[PDB]
Amino acid sequence: SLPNVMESAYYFEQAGVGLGTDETYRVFLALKQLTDTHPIQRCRFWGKILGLEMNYIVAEVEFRDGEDPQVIPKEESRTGANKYVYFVCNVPGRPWVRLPSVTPAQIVTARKIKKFFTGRLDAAVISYPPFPGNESNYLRAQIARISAGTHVSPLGFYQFDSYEENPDFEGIQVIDLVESLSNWVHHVQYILPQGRCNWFNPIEQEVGPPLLTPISEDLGIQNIPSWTTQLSSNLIPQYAIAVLRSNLWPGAYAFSNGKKFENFYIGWGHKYCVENYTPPSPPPVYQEYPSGPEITEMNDPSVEEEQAFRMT
Amino acid sequence: LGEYEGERNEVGERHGHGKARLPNGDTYEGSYEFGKRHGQGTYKFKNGARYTGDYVKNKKHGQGTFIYPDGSRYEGEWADDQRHGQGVYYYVNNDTYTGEWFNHQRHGQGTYLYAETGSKYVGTWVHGQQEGAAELIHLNHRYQGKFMNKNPVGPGKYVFDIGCEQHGEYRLTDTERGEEEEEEE
Amino acid sequence: MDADSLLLSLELASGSGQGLSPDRRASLLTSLMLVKRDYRFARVLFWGRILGLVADYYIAQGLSEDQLAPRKTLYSLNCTEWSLLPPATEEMAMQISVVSGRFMGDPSHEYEHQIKEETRLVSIIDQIDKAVAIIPRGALFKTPFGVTHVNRTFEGLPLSEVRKLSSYFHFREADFLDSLEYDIPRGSWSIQMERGNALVVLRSLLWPGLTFYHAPRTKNYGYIYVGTGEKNMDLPFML
């Protein structure tokens, strides 16, 4: 269940990425403790989101089967955004905190705010709109959005909702991976505007790209090309590693030697925007009932008319 | 025609207190003066609308209340059978306005509460429309600047509870220009 | 940061996670020694990176005797090929205000808002130095000869003084230097303790990518700006 985060760290070091060998092995042992304590099928060092006072050491976790106006409900089971339970940890050794489920109506549709993390999961999130949750829910929101926008893999490596390892993946060369983004695809499900990865009927279909969509289509912010590509160790290019720099989530990275791959986020947990952050406008101000004849003057009859009608 | 119960003079049509029903199906309870309406009373419409307050000739005037058919409601000052002066309106979704009025429209200073989100728009109004200088209060942000077409426009300004401002400018629809430096006041 | 930050990965030890590969680190060691040769600087600190959309500008800064002098900037795209970047002025600060977006790897790139990317590099590096270049309290001692030198007897800050923004100084013209406690916004600086609290990491929120290193036990310090190169004007919203 526990992956080799140290080999991934060594590959991260080739591109100037990683927390250092000692801190990375410290996080490796923390992940080992997480795997021994809880019944985890698979995990991986998702990333580390920087904070103001304290950071988080995020750990994506997938458990074994069967152990551990209109409100859009959440994906209760492992479908969509909530496929992976996300554990966090401030410094290694402190016990892992299980983050809560993502709520499409509340948590990931609060993407319109953009805030720092204080390091405290219980700290209040004050913003416009009022964020429905504490810092933990906002951390889950940014983790889910970063995963939707940044978890990518080579063109092969899986056959396609659901997917499995491709056994016949011959491998794409590193120069082929770097020169074009058509050789890379998104490894996880896109989050729809309502917050879900799979649509719920509130009572038209909002549709995103399929799972096996190339990331060359993942554009853009004022013609800035997403996923800046380069080669690590350019002086010895025949042992290079294909480096990917998203430019939509700074600190988000993707890597591959041409056979295997891994993803890693090390930013502040925010989306890049060329324009300055606009707080969203309030809803349109609603009008009164129109001054129609249905709410107009009573116009009581005069007693002269009453005498006229009485004479009968 | 309809019917009523109450007092009158020998010549005067109706001037006492009581209850009147009209040909159109609506009802009244309260005061009235000679062949007309005056003083405190209560309306009751067939559509579900109501009013409680004072009248002068045949028109809503002075302090009073109103319930509309759609569930929205109002109290405050009236004039010329229209909302006028200081008053408070409540909408169907618990959002409220409190402020001045001019001919059934929001005019002059007034506060609109976004009860959906807790924020408040405070400032000038022009004929039911959010225009002019106004102070838009969020939980910890307070935007100072001009409004036009129910949208911020013009230079400036944000004030933050952290102890600083942020000067800027609104150019396009809900779009912020290149933000200027932070101020200390 | 100095050459001691390039014999060991001091940059990635701060936990910011952005830094130099050992390829770039060894190349930078040799190249900054050759820069100190070719350009007669008292010291040659690695300023940091401006992460572009095509290539990253590796930036080095020359230090004179006389360390508060108008520090001379150098740039390199392939690390070793160091080139003397021109100095910054007020006109070139005003020139790039109309331009926004991520840096391009080629410094000959033009914006129609023309404006050269070299001018952007010069102005943004100057702005970062005037805003968020850090010096710990007492590391620099104003010599009586009208010149700033290293306070070579500087002992690292006490752990009581670690947590205060007053114990950190803007590395620029102005204990002579201005402290960080007046650097508005009041929450604009994040102070955190890594590596058994033998390491103080102080990151700029106004200019993301800056991470200032300091070892309280000794005089090992330095700042590196490895980041996108824009100013976070959204900082008061984000705090």
Side-chain angles (χ1 to χ4, degrees), chain A residues 17-19 45-50 250-253 264-269, chain C residues 15-18:
Chain A
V17 181
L19 319 174
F45 186 18
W46 184 90
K48 178 216 202 176
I49 291 155
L50 298 172
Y253 276 78
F264 193 68
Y265 186 79
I266 196 45
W268 293 93
Chain C
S16 305
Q18 304 311 75

Side-chain angles (χ1 to χ4, degrees), chain A:
Chain A
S1 65
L2 189 71
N4 189 3
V5 308
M6 280 299 346
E7 171 156 11
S8 62
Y10 162 75
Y11 286 123
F12 295 152
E13 258 317 347
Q14 303 202 10
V17 181
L19 319 174
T21 173
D22 90 355
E23 167 51 22
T24 305
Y25 185 67
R26 214 91 51 81
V27 171
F28 189 21
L29 296 158
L31 292 163
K32 173 155 174 39
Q33 227 198 331
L34 179 58
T35 51
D36 313 355
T37 315
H38 303 155
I40 297 174
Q41 159 49 250
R42 151 205 155 205
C43 64
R44 49 176 290 282
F45 186 18
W46 184 90
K48 178 216 202 176
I49 291 155
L50 298 172
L52 301 183
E53 307 337 327
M54 312 192 349
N55 309 310
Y56 312 84
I57 283 135
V58 187
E60 188 176 67
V61 165
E62 155 41 8
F63 283 112
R64 283 82 81 81
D65 294 352
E67 322 66 15
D68 285 8
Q70 179 58 57
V71 175
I72 310 301
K74 65 186 189 182
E75 293 80 349
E76 300 180 352
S77 73
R78 296 179 291 183
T79 81
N82 289 242
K83 194 142 71 153
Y84 309 107
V85 184
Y86 286 95
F87 290 85
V88 293
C89 154
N90 296 121
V91 315
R94 214 171 320 300
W96 292 86
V97 179
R98 193 221 181 81
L99 296 177
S101 197
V102 163
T103 305
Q106 268 182 346
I107 297 174
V108 285
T109 52
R111 58 179 87 171
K112 304 173 291 213
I113 84 189
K114 153 177 189 322
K115 293 222 72 163
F116 272 122
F117 301 95
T118 62
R120 285 180 318 282
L121 292 165
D122 321 329
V125 177
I126 310 305
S127 57
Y128 191 71
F131 183 89
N134 60 342
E135 267 290 2
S136 191
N137 294 266
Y138 186 59
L139 194 64
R140 277 287 295 122
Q142 300 304 105
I143 286 159
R145 286 208 296 150
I146 289 156
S147 293
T150 67
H151 279 200
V152 304
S153 76
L155 180 33
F157 204 101
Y158 73 93
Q159 299 171 312
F160 176 75
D161 296 349
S162 181
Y163 62 98
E164 77 296 17
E165 181 92 59
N166 166 340
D168 321 329
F169 179 43
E170 295 176 351
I172 300 159
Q173 314 322 138
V174 71
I175 190 65
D176 308 22
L177 289 171
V178 166
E179 71 63 20
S180 173
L181 298 168
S182 325
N183 325 62
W184 294 81
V185 315
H186 286 293
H187 212 57
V188 299
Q189 224 148 14
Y190 174 81
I191 294 158
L192 300 169
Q194 66 180 190
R196 291 188 67 116
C197 321
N198 39 343
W199 189 65
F200 156 101
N201 175 316
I203 308 304
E204 293 185 348
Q205 213 88 359
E206 51 255 20
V207 55
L211 262 185
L212 191 71
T213 296
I215 76 183
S216 58
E217 303 183 1
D218 188 21
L219 304 167
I221 301 159
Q222 298 191 4
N223 313 316
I224 287 165
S226 67
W227 298 106
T228 292
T229 62
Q230 63 175 321
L231 289 159
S232 80
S233 313
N234 211 309
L235 296 169
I236 313 95
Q238 83 302 359
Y239 289 119
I241 301 296
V243 187
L244 257 60
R245 283 224 303 273
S246 69
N247 317 333
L248 264 277
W249 303 91
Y253 276 78
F255 292 119
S256 173
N257 78 2
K259 301 286 185 169
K260 316 313 207 205
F261 86 102
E262 75 293 24
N263 287 278
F264 193 68
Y265 186 79
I266 196 45
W268 293 93
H270 305 151
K271 187 178 164 217
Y272 174 75
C273 274
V274 169
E275 311 78 349
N276 313 137
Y277 169 70
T278 44
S281 86
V285 69
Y286 330 108
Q287 307 340 329
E288 302 85 346
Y289 193 135
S291 299
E294 267 49 39
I295 51 156
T296 194
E297 193 178 350
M298 296 264 168
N299 193 32
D300 295 3
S302 161
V303 164
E304 288 75 10
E305 277 67 358
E306 291 188 348
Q307 186 62 31
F309 273 93
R310 270 192 295 268
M311 290 181 289
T312 185

Side-chain angles (χ1 to χ4, degrees), chain A residues 126 128 130 276 278 281-283 285-289 294-298 300 302-304 306 309, chain B residues 13-14 22 37 43 45 47 58 89 91 93 95 101 106 112 114 116-117 119 138 174 176-179:
Chain A
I126 310 305
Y128 191 71
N276 313 137
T278 44
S281 86
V285 69
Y286 330 108
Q287 307 340 329
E288 302 85 346
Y289 193 135
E294 267 49 39
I295 51 156
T296 194
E297 193 178 350
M298 296 264 168
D300 295 3
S302 161
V303 164
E304 288 75 10
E306 291 188 348
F309 273 93
Chain B
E13 300 182 50
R14 316 176 181 173
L22 301 93
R37 274 181 320 300
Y43 277 18
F45 287 68
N47 63 10
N58 60 329
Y89 195 101
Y91 299 88
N93 47 49
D95 276 13
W101 291 89
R106 283 82 68 75
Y112 179 81
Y114 298 88
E116 184 174 0
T117 89
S119 61
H138 307 307
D174 198 24
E176 185 72 62
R177 200 173 174 190
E179 293 235 311

Side-chain angles (χ1 to χ4, degrees), chain C residues 158-230:
Chain C
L159 302 322
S160 61
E161 295 191 356
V162 154
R163 192 56 34 69
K164 330 182 307 192
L165 298 170
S166 150
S167 306
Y168 294 118
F169 285 151
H170 296 279
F171 187 23
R172 51 155 165 81
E173 185 173 2
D175 302 328
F176 174 60
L177 311 209
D178 310 30
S179 62
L180 297 185
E181 75 203 331
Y182 330 118
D183 186 17
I184 195 167
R186 293 190 297 166
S188 60
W189 282 104
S190 156
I191 325 190
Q192 339 184 7
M193 304 298 287
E194 331 317 348
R195 297 297 204 282
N197 315 356
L199 176 36
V200 184
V201 173
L202 169 71
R203 296 191 191 79
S204 180
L205 310 182
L206 186 59
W207 282 99
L210 191 283
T211 165
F212 167 70
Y213 203 106
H214 182 44
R217 66 193 181 279
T218 174
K219 54 172 41 63
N220 236 8
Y221 73 91
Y223 67 100
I224 190 173
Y225 182 79
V226 50
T228 178
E230 291 66 352

